[PDB]
Design a protein around this ligand. Sequence first.
Ligand code: HEM
Ligand code: HEM
Ligand SMILES: C[C@H](O)[C@H](O)[C@H]1CNC2=NC(N)=NC(=O)C2=N1
Ligand SMILES: C[C@H](O)[C@H](O)[C@H]1CNc2nc(N)[nH]c(=O)c2N1
Ligand SMILES: [Zn+2]
Lengths: 420, 420
Amino acid sequence: RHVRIKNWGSGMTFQDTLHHKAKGILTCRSKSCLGSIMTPKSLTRGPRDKPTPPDELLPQAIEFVNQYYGSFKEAKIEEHLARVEAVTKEIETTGTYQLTGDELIFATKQAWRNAPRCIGRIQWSNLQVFDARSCSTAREMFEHICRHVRYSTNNGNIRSAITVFPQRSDGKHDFRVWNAQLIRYAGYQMPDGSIRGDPANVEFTQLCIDLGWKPKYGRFDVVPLVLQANGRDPELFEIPPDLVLEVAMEHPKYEWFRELELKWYALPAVANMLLEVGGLEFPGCPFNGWYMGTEIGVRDFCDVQRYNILEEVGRRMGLETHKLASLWKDQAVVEINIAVIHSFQKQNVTIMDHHSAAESFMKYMQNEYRSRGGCPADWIWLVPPMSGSITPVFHQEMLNYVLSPFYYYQVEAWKTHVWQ
Amino acid sequence: RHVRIKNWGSGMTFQDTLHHKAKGILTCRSKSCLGSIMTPKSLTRGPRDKPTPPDELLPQAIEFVNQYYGSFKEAKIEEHLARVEAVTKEIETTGTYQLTGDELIFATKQAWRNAPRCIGRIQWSNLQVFDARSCSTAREMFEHICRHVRYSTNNGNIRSAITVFPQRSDGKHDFRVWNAQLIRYAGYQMPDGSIRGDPANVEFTQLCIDLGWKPKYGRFDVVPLVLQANGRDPELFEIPPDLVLEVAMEHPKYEWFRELELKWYALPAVANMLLEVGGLEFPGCPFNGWYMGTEIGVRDFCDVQRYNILEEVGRRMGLETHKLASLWKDQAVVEINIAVIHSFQKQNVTIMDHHSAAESFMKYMQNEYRSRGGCPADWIWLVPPMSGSITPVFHQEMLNYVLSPFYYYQVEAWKTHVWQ
Ligand code: HEM
Ligand code: HEM
Ligand SMILES: C[C@H](O)[C@H](O)[C@H]1CNC2=NC(N)=NC(=O)C2=N1
Ligand SMILES: C[C@H](O)[C@H](O)[C@H]1CNc2nc(N)[nH]c(=O)c2N1
Ligand SMILES: [Zn+2]
C-alpha cells in the first residue's frame, strides 16, 4: 500500500512504502492538517525524570540492531544474532546498552537521512562522528566542541560533523548545549528599549549576561557556549575567536554594500537537538553542515525580526521603496543574496546557492526511493525562502513522516532546568 | 479544544475552533502528512450514477439552512425553522431540494471564504452571482458564460463573479465546462517535435481538434469552450475575440522585452470545479477574480513546463546564465514579474502584486478568527511562488481543513465521459 507522489515539473513519480515504518506521532487528522506548525510537540523529545524502563527499551534496541544489520550489503546473520543477544543481556544487566562506535556512526548518518526538513541530505554519508560519550565535565564538552569547530571549519573548506555526548541516563544528568547554535551573534535590548545585534537572540544573550558574560553591545558578538554537563547548572566558555571564521559582506557591483558593514559566520551548527536511537536519547549532539546562501541572505539579513536590512538596501539601490508593486523588495533580496554568495566565494568559504542545493536534493530523493522506497520530506522547509517555484523542489509532492533514528527538538533547557 | 497557531514575524497568535466543523476527509494520518499533494482525492468531488440518497442528503441540507439562517445579525427563527420544514418535505417528496436565490449567493461566497488555497479571500464578500440553474442547452451555457466574461472583464476593471449552472441530479445530466479555465491558450505539438504555445494545454488542445476545432498553430490561441449540457456530449463554442481582453508584455526599462512578443489574458476564471452546498453538487460554476502578478510572471511564464522564457530573458539581460550561483534565474524572474505588473497597470487592467496580496490575506485571516474562530488555509498554496519569506504569509502557521460549502476538484470530464 504505497502512496504515489509526483513531480509536476518532470512528471516523475515515486511509490512510498517507507512511511509504514514511521512513528504514529504527527498531529494531522482527517479533520485538519497542521503541517505548517514549526515546533510541534510531535517533533519534540522533552525532559526525563526516570530512566527508560528496560523492558520498554528492549524492543526499540532490537529494532535498531535489526536496522543496523539490515544496512549490510553483505549480511552478517551470525554477527547479527550475536549482537541482538549481547544487547538483550546488556539491557538485562545494566538496564541500558551502549552502541558500538560503528552503530553510532550509522545511527548519526541515518538520523540525518531521516531529517525531513534538511535539504542537504545528499551528503548524509559524509559525516564526521566525534564520539564524546566518555565525557563527564563542562570543560571537557568545551574542548570537544572546539575540536569539532576547528575540524568542520577546516580553513573554509567546511566539513560536516557531529559530536555525540553521553546518552541520557535518568534525565537528571543530561549533557546539553543550551545554545541553539554553536556560533550565533548576540542581541541586546538597549536602555531605551531598542535592540542591537540579532533581535532573535535577545533572551539567550540576557541568560548569558546573567551568568557572568560581559556584554559587548555590538552588532555581531559571538555569544558564549552555555554547557550543561551531567545535569549540573551550565557554565560559560567562549569559543576562541581564532576558531570562528567569518565573512565580510561585499557586493560585486555595489561598492557601497561594504558600507553596510555586514558579516556572517561560516559555520552553521545546530546544538540543541536530541538524537533518538533504538530507544536511547542523546540530549547533546551538535552537528553542522555548510551554509545555503538563502539562510543568511534571506532569513538572517532580511527577516523583519532579525537583521532587517531590506528597507535600507532598497533605499541604497535607488528603488521605488514607496510602493509594493515596484517589487523593490524582490530586487533587494536578490542583490543581498548575490552579495552573500559572492562574499563566501571571495573568501574561499564553502556555501551553496539554493538552486544547486534543490537540484542536489532531487537527486538525493530519487536515490532514496530507489534504495528504501521512501524519503520523509517537509515541503514547507525544503522549498527555499526565495524563488520557490524556480526550484525543482517546489514542484515535488512529498510525504512527511518521522522514522528512527531521528533528530528531535527538545524543550529549551533553561525552561526546564532546576538550578541548584 | 482549540489549536493555537502563530505568526513568527509579528508574534500574533490565533486559537482555532472552527476546525471541528470541518469534514473528516483529509488523508493525513499520525504516521504521515501528505499536505503537499496537489490534487488529492480528498479534495475531489467526482461523478455519480444515482441521485444522492435523500437520507444522506437531508442532514447536510439542514446543516446548510442552519448556517445560512445563522448568518444574519437579525435572526428569524420563524422563517428559519419553516425553511427547515420546507426543505425536509422537498427532499422527502422530490428526493432533493432547491436553494433560494439568496441562499445560493450565500453559498457561493461562503464556499469562496472556505477556499483554503485562495489568497484573494479578503474580497470574499464582493462576488456577483449569475444564476443559471435553469439552463438547458450548450448554446445557452455559452451565452451565460459570454455574459459572465463581459461583466467580469469590465473593460479592464476586473470584477469577481460566479455562474452557477443546474445542480447535479443523478450524475447523468451534469452541466459542465470541460476546460480548466474559461480563457486559456493552446499548446500544439509541432511536426519538428517542438511545442508551440502553452505546453500544459497540448492534451486538451488535441481534444478540441478531435471535436472539430481548427488548430490555429499560434503561441496564444484561445481554446474553444467545450461545454457539456445535461450530460450530453460536449459542444464547442469559441469566445468572441472582442470578449477576450489581453495585455501585451513590456518592461519599464528593458526596451527589448517587447521583442519577446508576449502577452497574457486579463481574466482568470476557474471553469472546472464543483460547488458543494448542503449535499448539493453544482458541477458547473465558473468563477473568476483578478490576477496576482506571480501567477503569470513566475508560473505561466517561468515554469519549465509552461512558456519557460527564463533562459532567453537571462541571456537578453546579459547575465551569467551558465552559472547557477550567479542567481541569474532570480534576477530574470524579478524583471519578468515587473514587466507583468507594469504592462497590466499601463493598460489599465486590474492586477495585484504578491506583497500587497499577502498583506490583505493577513488582514482577512485575522477578521476570520475574530469572526468564526477559524480560517482554513493551505500554507503551500498561499505562499507566493517567489520571495516566500519576504511575505508575511510564510511566517504564518495555518490549519488546513475542509468546510461546507466548498469548491472541490473533479475528475477531468473526458476521463469519465461515456460518449453517446
Ligand atoms: C551537508 C551540508 C548541509 C546543508 C547545506 C544543510 C542545510 C540545511 C538547511 C538549509 C536547513 C533548513 C534549516 C533552517 O532554515 O532553519 C537544514 C535543516 C536541518 N538540517 Fe541540514 N544541512 C547540512 C548538513 C546537515 C547535517 C550533517 C545534519 C545532521 C547530522 C543536518 C541536520 C538538519 C536538521 C535536523 C535540520 C532541521 C533543523 C530544524 O528543525 O531547525 N544537516 N539544513
Ligand atoms: C478576488 C480576486 C482573487 C485573487 C487575486 C485570487 C487569487 C488566487 C490565487 C493566486 C490562487 C492560487 C492559484 C494557483 O496558483 O494555481 C487562487 C486559487 C483559488 N481561488 Fe482565488 N482569487 C481571487 C478570487 C477568487 C474567487 C472570487 C473565488 C471563488 C468564487 C476564488 C476561488 C479560488 C479557488 C477555489 C482556488 C483554488 C484553485 C485550485 O485548486 O486550482 N478565488 N486564487
Ligand atoms: C508539489 C506541490 O504541491 C505543487 O507544486 C504546488 C505547490 N504550491 C502551489 N501553490 C499555488 N498557488 N499553485 C500551484 O500550482 C502550486 N503547486
Ligand atoms: C509558519 C511556517 O511553518 C514557518 O514560517 C516556516 C516555513 N518554512 C520554513 N523553512 C525553513 N527552511 N526554515 C524556517 O524557519 C521555516 N519557517
Ligand atoms: Zn498534514
